[PDB]
Each structure stands twice: as structure tokens, then as C-alpha cells.
Amino acid sequence: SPDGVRVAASTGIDLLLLDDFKLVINDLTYHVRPPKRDLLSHENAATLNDVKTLV
Amino acid sequence: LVQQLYTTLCIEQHQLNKERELIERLEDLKEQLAPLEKVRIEISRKAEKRTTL
């Protein structure tokens, strides 16, 4: 993840590609910046995220 | 929430826009057809005359 947190071995790619993320090879930290493609109002994204769990 | 989500995303408009696209695309399919429609309806009429003969 953009900070010390590392992603799992199960997170779906799109769930990852949502934002930047450092990819580490054997001895280097390649710093990926994927193209911003969320395309949804964050608040609206939130109020939907609220729904999904609430269901 | 979903209703607030509904109105806040102009979905009703998008719904129309969805269909409005389809009906338009169908018109295109009809448009390509009109030229080649008349040519077969002869070859139908022609191959019909030779058959009713």
C-alpha cells in the first residue's frame, strides 16, 4: 500500500488499482502510480459502500 | 440511502439514456437495410414470377 501496510495474497486487482501502490522486487521498491479511474463521487461511493455492507 | 443515491446520480436520466442509445442503434440497423432491401425484393419478385410460372 502507499504506506508500510502490505496487501494480501487475495485482494482483487481492481480493489488494488484504485490508488497508488509500491511494488517491491527482490531488492528494489518500484513505485507504481496506476491511472486514476475511480470515476465515482467519493461521498456517493461512500453512501453506496454504506449500502453494500448494510445489506 | 439508495433513493438518495438514486436522485443524486441522475440515474433516471441515465436509464432513459440507456434505452435511447439502444433504439438509436436499432435505427442504424434499419438504415443499413433499406438500400439492400429493395434489391432482394426484386430478386424475390423475380424468383417468384419464375416459380409461379
UniProtKB/Swiss-Prot annotation, chain A:
Top-level taxon of origin: Eukaryota
PTM (free text): Phosphorylation by CaMK2 in heart leads to increased MCU current. The regulation of MCU by CaMK2 is however subject to discussion: another group was unable to reproduce these results. Phosphorylated on tyrosines by PTK2B/PYK2, promoting oligomerization.
Localisation: Mitochondrion inner membrane
Induction info: MCU transcripts are down-regulated by microRNA miR-25. Down-regulation by miR-25 may protect cardiomyocytes against oxidative damage in cardiomyocytes.
Family according to the record: Belongs to the MCU (TC 1.A.77) family.
Subunit (UniProt): Homotetramer. Component of the uniplex complex, composed of MCU, EMRE/SMDT1, MICU1 and MICU2 (or MICU3) in a 4:4:1:1 stoichiometry. Interacts with CCDC109B/MCUB; this inhibits channel activity. Interacts with MCUR1. Interactions with MICU1 and MCUR1 are mutually exclusive. Interacts with SLC25A23.
Known role: Channel-forming and calcium-conducting subunit of the mitochondrial inner membrane calcium uniporter complex (uniplex), which mediates calcium uptake into the mitochondrial matrix. MCU channel activity is regulated by the calcium-sensor subunits of the uniplex MICU1 and MICU2 (or MICU3). Mitochondrial calcium homeostasis plays key roles in cellular physiology and regulates ATP production, cytoplasmic calcium signals and activation of cell death pathways. Involved in buffering the amplitude of systolic calcium rises in cardiomyocytes.
This protein's domain notes: The selectivity filter, in which calcium ions are arranged in single file, is composed of two acidic rings separated by one helical turn along the central axis of the channel pore. The N-terminal MCU domain is required for efficient Ca(2+) uptake and for interaction with MCUR1. It is not required for targeting to the mitochondria, oligomerization, interaction with MICU1 and MICU2, or assembly of the uniplex complex.
Protein name in the entry: Calcium uniporter protein, mitochondrial
Natural source organism: Homo sapiens
Gene name, Swiss-Prot/TrEMBL: MCU
Residues of the full protein shown: 129 to 183 of 351
UniProtKB/Swiss-Prot annotation, chain B:
Induction note: MCU transcripts are down-regulated by microRNA miR-25. Down-regulation by miR-25 may protect cardiomyocytes against oxidative damage in cardiomyocytes.
Source domain of life: Eukaryota
Post-translational modification: Phosphorylation by CaMK2 in heart leads to increased MCU current. The regulation of MCU by CaMK2 is however subject to discussion: another group was unable to reproduce these results. Phosphorylated on tyrosines by PTK2B/PYK2, promoting oligomerization.
Any coiled-coil regions, as ranges: 11-42
Annotated compartments: Mitochondrion inner membrane
Assembly and oligomerization: Homotetramer. Component of the uniplex complex, composed of MCU, EMRE/SMDT1, MICU1 and MICU2 (or MICU3) in a 4:4:1:1 stoichiometry. Interacts with CCDC109B/MCUB; this inhibits channel activity. Interacts with MCUR1. Interactions with MICU1 and MCUR1 are mutually exclusive. Interacts with SLC25A23.
General function of this protein: Channel-forming and calcium-conducting subunit of the mitochondrial inner membrane calcium uniporter complex (uniplex), which mediates calcium uptake into the mitochondrial matrix. MCU channel activity is regulated by the calcium-sensor subunits of the uniplex MICU1 and MICU2 (or MICU3). Mitochondrial calcium homeostasis plays key roles in cellular physiology and regulates ATP production, cytoplasmic calcium signals and activation of cell death pathways. Involved in buffering the amplitude of systolic calcium rises in cardiomyocytes.
Domain notes per entry: The selectivity filter, in which calcium ions are arranged in single file, is composed of two acidic rings separated by one helical turn along the central axis of the channel pore. The N-terminal MCU domain is required for efficient Ca(2+) uptake and for interaction with MCUR1. It is not required for targeting to the mitochondria, oligomerization, interaction with MICU1 and MICU2, or assembly of the uniplex complex.
Family according to the record: Belongs to the MCU (TC 1.A.77) family.
Protein name according to UniProt: Calcium uniporter protein, mitochondrial
Upper lineage: Eukaryota, Metazoa, Chordata, Craniata, Vertebrata
